[model samples]
Target: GSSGSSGNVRVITDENWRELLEGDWMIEFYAPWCPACQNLQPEWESFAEWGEDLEVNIAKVDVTEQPGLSGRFIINALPTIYHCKDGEFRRYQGPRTKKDFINFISDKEWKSIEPVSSWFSGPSSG
Candidate 1:
């Protein structure tokens, strides 16, 4: 019953793109003027919002705005979703929903995404 929009999904850009790639993520490439992409907005919003409970980080990139992302991922469609990981990435095919995204994300491997939280507990910066 995880039916919602990815309203909380992080916005991806050339700057933080590579840094966020260190984990399991769903990044959707879209164009503002595209109808197909506009249609995906509400659903995507819900998807990303629900992603957290499932341990998934959903994000999006505006190809028209971030040319760097287009070049990095070879985005040629109005709505293209990419599964980002430390290695062996893939593009999502057909249909976009909260439930389906969970399965799709789970199907991928995040073995290379090492959680270094424990390694950075030395002291506080503030």
Candidate 2:
């Protein structure tokens, strides 16, 4: 059985983040230029592998490339990790090891969580 460790986390964009936010849980923030982001890739991969078993979705976004999203999320640093469920968002700053990432996901029940309007929804300039 191949785990999702080898799988690539979806590259989210400002356009699709809304739809993607509908999921139960996800980790969707990153930056390509950050060394920590690069270093954390394998850990994220392993975390995603475990996520497969847990049925959680692990995602990533290149903050530098997506200024709109970065501004929307108020992401001020590299390797920001968001724990989102039902459109609500909780941000975890800094880099994470595989164990920590897995533990973070394991410690939460996402289905019952409600969206945080302060962070997730507002006027969208279309």
Candidate 3:
């Protein structure tokens, strides 16, 4: 079975985080108490609207609600975005805007960045 999103960004929990390894994904880690995370809400939502068209999964995780995931990904920042393709992960260090998000995947800019180290590949692997 498959799922669909009508402009709603997918909610990623610890249980489903592994699914990211199956395809291209952009996931944001955020906490409600973090102002930076709040400020990025709209931009992230807007970016999610293009997920289907871009053929990527745009999703977010609430670190406050998923401590396991927070620790698994080693989320040291309040608002962090990760890019994943075929099980490989990379930190998204680009601008936090819809345009940049779109370009990051559409233009394949993520290839220019280094992927997450093998030491922290995923939960069980790490």
Candidate 4:
């Protein structure tokens, strides 16, 4: 099966982040020492459990470990969340609860937010 997350959230790093461009994903940019990020861990994991139900991939990126990905995504805040659909990225600025996360995608609330654009052109694939 092509199931990416079989109950746990997937980890995104500099090496394989390109895979994100092809899926419906909710990815968090976090650092280990950040309290906000720490607080979000449980909720994030719980949300991952529903990823299959929601038909959206739940993933996280440790900015401390994947600086390259942090730069590529231009993550500027602790525990930043992004909703990605086929390479189009939108910053998730709503409440950080598991239910909120589910509704953000399930209800298609992301469609109302402006996408994060700039150098997000897939780096030209050159």
**Candidate No. with top lDDT:** 3
Top candidate, metric TM-score: 3
Error of 4 at 29 (Å): 0.7
CA lDDT, every model vs. true structure? 0.69, 0.67, 0.83, 0.82
TM-score of 3: 0.88
Q: Candidate 1, residues 26-116: lDDT per residue as tens digits? A: 7888788899888898879878766777787778888778887687666676687777665346667648876677666665433333322
Residues 70-101 of candidate 4 have per-residue lDDT tens digits of 88877787778988898888989788898888
Candidate 3 clashing pairs, residues 3+ apart or interchain: none
Q: Candidate 2 on 8-86: residue-level lDDT in tens? A: 4766787867765686556656666677777787778777777757767777877768888777777676666777766
Question: Where does the lowest 10-residue lDDT sum fall in candidate 3?
Answer: 117-126
Backbone clashes per model, in order?
A: 11, 2, 0, 0
Query: What's the TM-score of each model vs. the native?
Result: 0.73, 0.74, 0.88, 0.88
Of the two candidates 2 and 3, the one with more favorable TM-score, higher being better, is: 3
RMSD in Å for all candidates? 8.9, 4.8, 2.5, 2.2
For candidate 2, what is the TM-score?
0.74
Name the TM-score of candidate 4. Answer: 0.88
In candidate 2, where is summed lDDT lowest over 10 consecutive residues?
109-118
